[PDB]
Amino acid sequence: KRKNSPRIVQSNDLTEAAYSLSRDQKRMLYLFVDQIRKSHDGICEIHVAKYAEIFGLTSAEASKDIRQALKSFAGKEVVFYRYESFPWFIKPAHSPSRGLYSVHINPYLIPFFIGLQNRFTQFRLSETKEITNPYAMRLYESLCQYRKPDGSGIVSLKIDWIIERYQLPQSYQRMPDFRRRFLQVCVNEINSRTPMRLSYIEKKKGRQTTHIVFSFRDITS
DNA sequence: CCTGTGACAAATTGCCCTCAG
DNA sequence: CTGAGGGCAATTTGTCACAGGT
Ligand SMILES: [Mg+2]
Ligand SMILES: [Mg+2]
Ligand code: NA
Questions:
Q1: Domain boundary among A72, A100, A129
Q2: Which of A26, A79, A130, A198, CA to CA, is 20 to 30 A from A186?
Q3: What interhelical angle do A23-37 and A48-55 show, nearest 10?
Q4: Long-range contacts of residues A54-62, Cβ cutoff 8 Å, at least 24 apart
Q5: How far is the CA of A136 from the C1' of B8 (A)?
């Protein structure tokens, strides 16, 4: 089963937001949104020991992952559409005791994490915790936004949108590099590392490729 | 314009080791 | 013991020249 992993549930506004976070920062961001989703002033807490347990890390590496990611949030903003930009943190994180980190999520991000009535993305945390490339995590979440109860779905993602919201590096505006370093890589991780089985076709307009059309089912069928 | 691939650079990985308390 | 440090080599991601229209 996967029912025992924490059910991550985020607004589509966040699934579609424009930002650049590392894998480690997105791993924590899941836990933050989960904490905020379960009650708020934006003040969340990471334990090194539980982070290590969740993500299959040693204490030392989980301490390292968390400390370095927390420092890297500074200067990072997230832009929400459907244009509004917010800093993720409004205070540096601090450790009030060994193994514990207190973080100050911008309380104006809370609605954007929670979202509207039925416009949300859900996945068990187990589905995303073995993905390594943060862009593959972005792709996974977008796919999950269109997932049906039976774990299947189909969605056309425009490439300029992917580039803008996932904030892909500039060289991936060259479509061969997009294919090789983003698309094939992230689809391979999802197939290798999640319960989702994913294929895609490219949509052309004249000489250009404009959209990637993703179709997926769950291994459980 | 478009494509894929080789080559190189930068980033990131899981590991390793030390040591304070 | 944990976890806050500093460190590593191998691997992956990010970039671009070049060759050719597959
Ligand atoms: Mg609180
Ligand atoms: Mg790490
Ligand atoms: Na790597």
A1: A129
A2: A79
A3: 110
A4: A54/A125, A54/A129, A55/A27, A55/A129, A56/A129
A5: 24
Resolution in A: 1.9
Residues A117 and A207 in one domain: no
Q: Are residue A45 and residue A122 in the same domain, yes or no?
A: yes
Residue A99 burial (CB count, 10 A): 16
Q: Are A122 and A170 members of one domain?
A: no
Instruction: Tally the residues of chain A.
Output: 221
> Looking at the structure, do residues A38 and A101 belong to the same domain, yes or no?
yes
Strand partners for A132 = none
Q: Show the tokens assigned to A79.
A: 């832009």
Q: Which ligand is nearest to the CA of A68?
A: 2
Contacts of A46 (CB under 8 A, 6+ apart): A28, A31, A66, A100, A101, A103
Q: Which ligand is nearest to the CA of A62?
A: 2
The one-letter amino acid at A122: Q
SS3 label, residue A145 = helix
Which residues in range 51-110 of chain A are in contact with strand C, contact meaning CB within 7 A of any of its atoms?
52, 59-60, 62-64, 66-67, 95, 98-99
Could you tell me the distance, in angstroms and rounded to a whole number, from the CA of residue A57 to the centre of ligand 2? 8
Same domain, A141 and A187: yes
Q: Are residues A215 and A156 in the same domain?
A: yes
A4 lies in which domain range? 1-129
Q: Are A78 and A57 in contact (CB under 8 A)?
A: no
* Closest ligand by atom to A105 CA: 1
The number of folded domains in chain A is: 2
